[PDB]
Structures are given as C-alpha cells and as structure tokens.
Amino acid sequence: EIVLTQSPGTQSLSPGERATLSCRASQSVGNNKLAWYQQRPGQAPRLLIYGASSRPSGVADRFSGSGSGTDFTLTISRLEPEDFAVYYCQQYGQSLSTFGQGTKVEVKLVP
Amino acid sequence: QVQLVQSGAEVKRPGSSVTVSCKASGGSFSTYALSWVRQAPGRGLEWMGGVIPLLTITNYAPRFQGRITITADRSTSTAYLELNSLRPEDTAVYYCAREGTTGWGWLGKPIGAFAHWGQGTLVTVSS
C-alpha cells in the first residue's frame, strides 16, 4: 500500500492562529488524488479537500489544500473553536485507498 | 440532497456474525459506490471495501477480505457489511461513505474521495 504519514500526530495551537498539517506519502499519489477530512468528537468525518486542492461546496475558504507528488499540506487559517478536531489525509490514486493516522489539532493550554 | 443513514448500534458475542446496513437517498441515478470504513476506539480510519449497487460490483481491501462480506440491494439503494465471525478486535464504529462518479454522465468509475458519510454504527463485541 501507499503509507501516508501525518506528523506530528498532535499540534497545540490557539484560536486565530494558522495551522499547517503535513501528509507525506511513501509513493507518488497519482493525479493528486488526495483528500483531507475533519472529524470532531462523536461525529463522522467531513470532507474538506479533494484533488489535493479542491474544496467542496459548503466548506469554508479558510481551509486550503496544496502540494503534489509525495508531499501534501492542509492549511487552516483563523482557527475557530470548531476547528479543534482530528484531521485525516487519504489517497485514492490507487484502487487500494489508504488513510493517514490522523493529526489532532488541540488547544494550547499553559501547563 | 444526498443522505446516508446506517442501522443502529449492536452488541454481539464472540464467534457470532453481524450485518450493518447503509441506506442512501438523494443524489443522481448513477454508478456511485458505498464504501465501509472502520474506526477502532481511540484509533484511525481504515477502508474495508465497497460496492456499486447499480452494477453489483464489489471491491475489498485485502486485509479485510477474508473476514467480511459486502453486498447491496440496488432497488433500495442499501449497502450491507457483514462481519462474519466476531472477535474483540472487531469492536469499532463502522462508517459507510459514498463515492460519487466523475465527469459527465451517470455511468463511470467512482472517485475515491468520500463526500458523504453515514452517522456510524457502533459494534461492540461482548463476552
């Protein structure tokens, strides 16, 4: 399979901040067939990005996909309360579809 | 317009089988796929396989093929995931997700991206 590696696995951030999330592929993802999903607690995954950079209708434009080949990036600007969730990438450039292990975007609490 | 609704949570003994259902409404009359995705507790997402109900074509992930059966009833736009012999490892939320077709026309290879999801079905293996 194409192994997709999202790291780091957790990122601690504040509201208003920009988040960059990386997805790296063990092989080239054909035709940039890479999607991103947001999953809030208790909820089903929701599609944010497909074709690497395409945004479904009804997804806010602060979500942006970029990259190609083996190196893909989701950028979330102006983090809103709602955006603290787990984010997954997915390649479907081969018939055996695979997901990354997920990146948790969580609020940075002063310890 | 497209909505996917799954059958309710189930509790099952080890060695038993269970069948989870996913009913799709709305969308265009087309060769869409309904795929099944596993999420174990605290864990990530894994594609198990899928079916195109219009054409009775099924597609499995190799690591799941030996232990599951995926079918569809095309007249009710309902896809089914049977887990054939349950173990504790099989405790998970199972999601259905719909792959649409690409390009003009009702008839085409499903895209691999999942634009629509069911609410999930928790399967708990007791004992």
Q: Find the CATH number of the domain harbouring B84.
A: 2.60.40.10
B97 chain-A contacts, CB cut-off 8 A: 45
- Secondary structure element (H or E) that encloses residue B58, with its range: strand B57-60
Chain A residues in contact with B59 by the CB 8 A cut-off are: 95
Which 3 state secondary structure label does DSSP give A31? helix
- State how far the Cα of A81 lies from the Cα of B90, in Å rounded to an integer: 33
Query: Are the CB atoms for B6 and B79 separated by under 8 Å?
Result: no
Distance CA B42, CA B26 (A): 32
Contact between residue B113 and residue A50 where contact means Cβ atoms under 8 Å apart: yes
Q: Is A104 on the interface with B (CB under 8 A)?
A: no
Q: Are B116 and B101 in contact (CB under 8 A)?
A: no
Partner residue facing A98 (CB), from B47, B115, B119 = B47
| Method for this entry | X-ray
The domain containing residue B102 runs over which residues?
1-127
Coil vs helix vs strand at B74: helix
Kindly identify which residue of chain A lies nearest to residue B41, measuring between CA atoms.
Answer: A42
From A108, A102, A90, A109, select the one nearest A40 (Cα to Cα): A102
Q: What angle do CA B109, A38, B36 make, to 5 degrees?
A: 45
CA distance B26 to B14: 37
| Bridge-based pairing state of the strands B33-39 and B92-99 | antiparallel
Angle at A13 between CA A9 and CA A16, to 5 degrees: 135
Spatial distance between the Cα atoms of A58 and A7, rounded to a whole number of angstroms: 27
Residue burial B64-84, b: 16+ Cβ < 10 Å; e: rest: beeebebebeeeebbbbbebe
Q: Show the CA angle centred on residue B92, arms to residues A42 and A48, nearest 5°.
A: 45
Q: Among partner residues B44, B113, B119, which is closest to A35 by beta-carbon distance? A: B113
Locus of tokens 């806010």:
A60
Resolution given for this structure, in angstroms? 2.4
B117·A46 Cβ contact <8 A: yes
B20 within 8 A of B6, measured Cβ to Cβ: yes
Sort out which chain B residues have CB atoms less than 8 A from A93's CB and list them: 112
What's the number of domains chain B is made of? 1
Q: Which residues of A touch B46 (CB under 8 A)?
A: 99
Residue A89's domain spans which residues? 1-111
Overall domain count for chain A = 1
For residue B27, CA distances in Å to B73, B98, B99, B106 come to: 17, 10, 11, 11
Query: Whole-angstrom Cα distance, residue B60 to residue A82?
Result: 34
CATH number for position A110: 2.60.40.10
